[PDB]
Amino acid sequence: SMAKLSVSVEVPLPPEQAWEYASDLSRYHEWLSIHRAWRSKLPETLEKGTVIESIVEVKGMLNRVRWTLVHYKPPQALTLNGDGRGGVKVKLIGKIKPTDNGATVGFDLHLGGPALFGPIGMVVAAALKSDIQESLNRFKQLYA
């Protein structure tokens, strides 16, 4: 078990559209502020077990992360495990749910591994809360 942060946005989009945009990895660089590089070729189709590598920046720190799709259920849920260099271990639970006026796109992000159990974890957690929320706001601005 690990501590976690939670972020969400409501978009004026039906869930199937919100899913299409949220899983369009080729456009993450237009709204995900922490993304810095892809380090493996992006697949045409995602599936449970898909593995992708990227480099992210959080509060000025770079980290190369291997992402594994451990749950994949369009158009409503995905879970991604991340193993970063230096002892970073994260789990990203994504959920897309229909609402009255569109759909919510929210994430629970568990932050762990030795690196984030240590004193830097609350720095990283606070920075990620802001960065991911701002990114979701950009997602909404770009796609809706």
Author numbering: 0 to 143
Original paper wording:
Meromycolate extension acyl carrier protein (AcpM) serves as the carrier of fatty acyl chain shuttling among the individual FAS-II components during the progression of fatty acid elongation. In this study, MSMEG_5634 in Mycobacterium smegmatis was identified as a novel acyl-AcpM-binding protein. MSMEG_5634 and its homologous proteins are highly conserved among mycobacteria and belong to the SRPBCC (START/RHOs_alpha_C/PITPs/Bet v1/CoxG/CalC) superfamily, containing a START domain that functions as a lipid-binding domain involved in eukaryotic signal transduction as well as a cyclase/aromatase domain for the biosynthesis of polyketide antibiotics in Actinomycetes. MSMEG_5634 can transport acyl-AcpM away from FAS-II by forming the MSMEG_5634/acyl-AcpM complex and contributes to intrinsic sensitivity to FAS-II inhibitors.
MSMEG_5634 has a helix-grip structure that contains seven-stranded antiparallel β-sheets (named β1 to β7) and four α-helices (α1 to α4). α1 and α2 are two short consecutive helices located between β1 and β2, and α3 is also a short α-helix which is followed by the long C-terminal helix α4. A clear linear electron density was observed inserted into the pocket of MSMEG_5634, which might be a chain of a fatty acid based on its shape, indicating that MSMEG_5634 may bind fatty acid chain-containing substrate. The overall structure of MSMEG_5634 is similar to that of the TcmN polyketide cyclase/aromatase domain but with differences in the conformation of proposed active site residues. According to the protein sequence and structure, the corresponding residues of MSMEG_5634 are Tyr-27, Arg-63, -65, and -84, but the side chains of Arg-63, -65, and -84 all point to the outside of the pocket. Third, the ligand-binding pocket of MSMEG_5634 is more hydrophobic than the pocket of TcmN ARO/CYC.
